[PDB]
Amino acid sequence: QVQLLESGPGLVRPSETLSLTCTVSGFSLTSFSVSWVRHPSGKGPEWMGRMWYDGYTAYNSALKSRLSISRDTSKNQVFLKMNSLQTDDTGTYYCTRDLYGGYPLGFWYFDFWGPGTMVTVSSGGGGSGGGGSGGGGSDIKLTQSPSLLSASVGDRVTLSCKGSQNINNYLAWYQQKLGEAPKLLIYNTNSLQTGIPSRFSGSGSGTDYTLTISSLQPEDVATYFCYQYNNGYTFGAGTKLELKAAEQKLISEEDLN
Amino acid sequence: WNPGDYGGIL
Numbered sequence: 001q002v003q004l005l006e007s008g009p010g011l012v013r014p015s016e017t018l019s020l021t022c023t024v025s026g027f028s029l030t031s032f033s034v035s036w037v038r039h040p041s042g043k044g045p046e047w048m049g050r051m052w053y054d055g056y057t058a059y060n061s062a063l064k065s066r067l068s069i070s071r072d073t074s075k076n077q078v079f080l081k082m083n084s085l086q087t088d089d090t091g092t093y094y095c096t097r098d099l100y101g102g103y104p105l106g107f108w109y110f111d112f113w114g115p116g117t118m119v120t121v122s123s124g125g126g127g128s129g130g131g132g133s134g135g136g137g138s139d140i141k142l143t144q145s146p147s148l149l150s151a152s153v154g155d156r157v158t159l160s161c162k163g164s165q166n167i168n169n170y171l172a173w174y175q176q177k178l179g180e181a182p183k184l185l186i187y188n189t190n191s192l193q194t195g196i197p198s199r200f201s202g203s204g205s206g207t208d209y210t211l212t213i214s215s216l217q218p219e220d221v222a223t224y225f226c227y228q229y230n231n232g233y234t235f236g237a238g239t240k241l242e243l244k245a246a247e248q249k250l251i252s253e254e255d256l257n
Numbered sequence: 258w259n260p261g262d263y264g265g266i267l
Contacts, residue, residue, distance in 0.1 A: 050262050058261030104265025170266055233262050 002026030004034075006095040008117030014085045018119065022078040022095040029071050030054070032098040034078045035110060036069075037182075037235070040091035041127030042137030043255040045174075045182065045225055045235035051078065053102050061232065062256070088253075089121035094181060109172050109227075113181035128251050136249025141256050142236030144226060149239065151216055159211040159239060161226040166207050170230040173202050173211055176223040176238065185224070186211075 007021040022034055036048040049059040051069040059067055068081040078095065094116050099108035120126055128137045143162040151157040161171065169189050174182035186192050186202040189209060201212045213220050223238035234257040242248070 052261040052264065056259070056261035058259035058263075061258065100264075107265045168267070229262070229266060233258055 002097065002112055004095050004097060004112055004114035006093060006114045006117045008093055008119040010118065011120045012085065013123050014087050014121060016085055018082040018085060018121065020080040020082065020093055020095075020117065020119075022080075022114065024076045024078070024097075027076075027097065027101075029073045029076065029078060031101040035096040035098070036080050037094040037096060037113075038089075038091045039094065039116070040089065040253075040255070042139075042251065042253045043091075043127075044138070044140035044237065044257065046255070046257055047227075047233045047235060048080070053104075058233075085121050087122050087125060090119075090126045091121075092116035092118050099184075107229075109187050109229075110184055113183075116181060127253065128249070133247055136247070137251035137253040138240065139250075139252050139254055140237045142226065142228075142234060144224075144237040144239065147237050147239055148242050150242070151213070153216055153218065155216050157213050157216070159213070159224055161204075161209040161211070161236060163207050163209075163226075163228055163236075165231040167209070167228045167230045169205060170228065171202070171204075171209050172227040172229070173200070174225040174227055174235065175200075176225065177219070177221075182223075182225055182235075 003025040005023045012018050033052050035050040039045050048063050049067050051057050057069045066083050070079045095114045096110045097112040099111050128135050145160045171189050172187045173185045175185045176182040184193050199214055203210045225238045226236040
């Protein structure tokens with residue numbers, strides 16, 4: 001077994017420091033480099049950073065001088081120390097293992113996402129709530145068209161990812177199902193993960209990239225995030241199903257990726 | 258962004 005246990009307290013106070021600790025039962029830390037990803041309560045996936053194979057901490061342009069990765073390779077622990085805590089950082093915090101172990105050439109990217117530690121960085125608030133009728137918000141920047149859609153079992157539907165800056169060919173498509181961590185579906189635009197047949201076709205070049213969901217089975221009702229790796233390192237908007245006979249609430253929680 | 262996230266791609 002290879003088990004990535006990212007540790008967090010449930011509730012933490014703004015202003016101070018949060019040490020998110022990935023205790024890994026399986027691999028030694030220099031082999032399959034750990035990547036850190038936050039998904040907040042009504043916002044979407046931001047990539048925070050990666051400490052790579054020899055020892056380099058690479059980071060997000062907005063979350064840059066807040067983040068300090070130390071690591072104990074004898075105890076199996078990666079320590080993301082998040083300094084100067086802000087009131088909107090309530091979220092499920094992920095640690096993700098690499099597919100390549102030490103060797104870089106033609107980079108395959110990511111396999112084992114840990115379970116997501118739900119840490120409320122907010123002293124009385126969080127995101128959206130109330131009392132029975134109270135809960136609803138989702139606002140993110142990177143243009144995936146159509147993100148809100150209405151497709152049934154059998155129907156072919158194409159998700160067109162237009163990037164905010166130019167990508168060349170460098171995009172991994174990540175399928176998040178209801179109750180799941182984001183699963184790697186197709187890497188480098190059009191190269192499928194060893195395991196999945198020729199059915200989800202991610203096709204394009206430069207800025208606009210087309211994921212055709214061809215034979216739509218019940219497993220295909222999911223959120224398909226574009227991880228662009230050329231200018232920045234951002235996961236984009238994804239996909240959601242709009243329920244017409246329900247409480248349709250959209251509180252404007254602004255995520256800039 | 259950095260040599261680190263840029264591993265073996267371009």
